[PDB]
Structure formats: C-alpha cells, structure tokens
C-alpha cells in the first residue's frame, strides 16, 4: 500500500490537476464525477443548514474546487494536506499567481448552480479571503494537525482523501476519530469518496486505495462516534484507465 512518503516523492500536483480537474466540454467520466461532487457540495453547504465559523478541509491536495460552495457558509477555512508540493500548488492559486492552475471553468459552473448572484472574479475573491491557514496534516496522527492550535471547528470536510490515506479499516476508523478531535460536539463531518476502489492513477504513477463498500464506510463512521444525517451512493465510475471504483459516496455526519 502506497506509503506516506510515496506521496512526498511521487504525487505530482500539476499532473493530478490536469488528469482529473480540467473540466472540458467533452462529457468524460472525470467531468461527470466532478459535476456530481460540485452539486453535492452546493446542496450540502448552500441548500442545507451546514454553516458556521470554521471549516477544516482534510487532504485538499492541490485542488480548491471542494471549497467553492463552502466559502459562502463558513467565515474561516483552514486547508491541509500531508504533502508540501500540494500545498504549494494550492498557494499558487490562493495568491492568484499567473502560473496557477486554471479553475475558471469550474468556478463558472459553481456560480451557475447558485443562480449567478456572484461573478467568477468575486467567487474567487471570497474563497481567497476565507482561506486563513494552509497546514501540514496527517489523518493517521491522533492530533492530525500536530502542534498547530485551532479552536473547535464547526465542520470537517474530506474529499477523496480517506480511501487514499488509510491502508485498512482499523486505520480508516481511527482517522475518523482523529478527525473528530477537531470538531465541536454536534459538528459536521463531510466525506465524499470512491467506492470499492483499490487504486487510482496519475500519469504513470499508481496509487493504492482502500476498497470499501457503503456498509463498511457507514459502520466505520458510526463506530467513530458520529451520527449519520445522510448518505448517498452513486454508480458513476472513473475511466477504466484511471481508477477501478464501482462508484462514489457522500455523507454528512454529526459528532456526539
Ligand atoms: N496520511 C495522510 N494524512 C493527510 N492527508 C493524506 C495522507 N495520505 C495521503 N493524503 C492526501 O490525500 C490526498 C488525496 S488526492 C485528493 C485531493 C483532493 N481532496 C481532491 O479531491 O482532488 C493527497 O493530496 C494526499 O496528500
Ligand atoms: C481523482 O482523485 C482520486 C480518484 C480516485 C481515488 C480512489 N481512491 O479511487 C482517489 N483519488 C484521490
């Protein structure tokens, strides 16, 4: 199983962004999943009462799409990944560097969903002001953020991170409990991940994935001390050359 250090030395942020998040008009599997991720988040953060002062995004990678709806609903976002190369790609964008990945076709899509109340430039600006800290995280540690002191969070969001970081169910469950330690009682956990997936590809590089179904996922969440508010399974897969998943899931849970 892909160890922590394989992420340090072989996860190329740029390549990853190119292969999954380019969001072209050709209706490929990777674009379809992205559309569904965005609609989920929109529905979670805008249409439901999922709001508060602080959101901690766990395993952001070099991607910022997952925070476009969330910035409307949280005054402060803290982003975290285990890999500095990913935090640097993400900082390129937060500092609006001309060499940052083009997110604009994704930014326009999220503006659409919310009835174009805001223009692109203002959607982007709002997110940049929401992101207060960019931190090293490690879901396997019982203090995932290590030394860094944060107040209790209103929400923890993790997208396609947990299947990647955890080699087994004990580890997956402990991670969820580890993540729980950053949460207010009654606070929100939001996860979306691949179903029954044992690998994903970035260019030439293969990356291990923990293949779990809806039953294991849900049981691991409940066991970790969460109460499941809702849970959704979708059939849509990645391209067969890219991952071997049967689908994806979303859940919103509350801490006890
Ligand atoms: N032990 C660990 N703790 C925290 N993050 C980890 C981790 N092991 C792997 N990761 C991170 O999990 C991420 C999976 S790539 C997914 C990134 C992003 N959320 C997206 O939706 O595209 C990688 O960025 C990697 O750094
Ligand atoms: C597009 O990014 C991802 C796709 C599929 C993954 C999986 N575990 O199947 C993980 N992952 C990070």
Numbering used by the authors: 5 to 260
What does the paper say about this structure?
NNMT is implicated in various disease conditions such as metabolic disorders, neurodegenerative diseases and cancer, and tissue NNMT expression or plasma levels of its product MNA have been proposed as biomarkers for these conditions. Human and mouse NNMT proteins are very similar in size, consisting both of 264 amino acid residues. The biologically active unit is a monomer.
JBSNF-000088 was found to be tightly bound to human NNMT in presence of SAM (molar ratio of enzyme:SAM:compound ~1:5:10) with a 5 K shift in melting temperature (Tm). Co-crystals were obtained with JBSNF-000088 for both human and mouse NNMT enzymes and X-ray crystal structures were determined at 2.48 Å and 1.99 Å resolution in P21 and P212121 space group, respectively. JBSNF-000088 was found to be methylated in the human and mouse NNMT structures with the cofactor SAM correspondingly being demethylated to SAH. The compound is surrounded by Tyr-20 (from N-terminal domain), Leu-164, Asp-167 (from central domain), Ala-198, Ser-201, Tyr-204, Ser-213, Tyr-242, Ala-247 (from C-terminal domain) and SAH within 4.0 Å. The methylated product is bound below the hairpin structural motif at the nicotinamide pocket, and its pyridine ring stacks between Tyr-204 (from hairpin) and Leu-164. The methoxy group interacts with Tyr-20 (from N-terminal helix). In the binding site of mouse NNMT, a further interaction, though probably weaker, is observed between the amino group of the amide and Ser-247. In the human NNMT, this position has an alanine. Therefore, JBSNF-000088 may act as a competitive substrate analog that is very slowly converted to its N-methylated product.
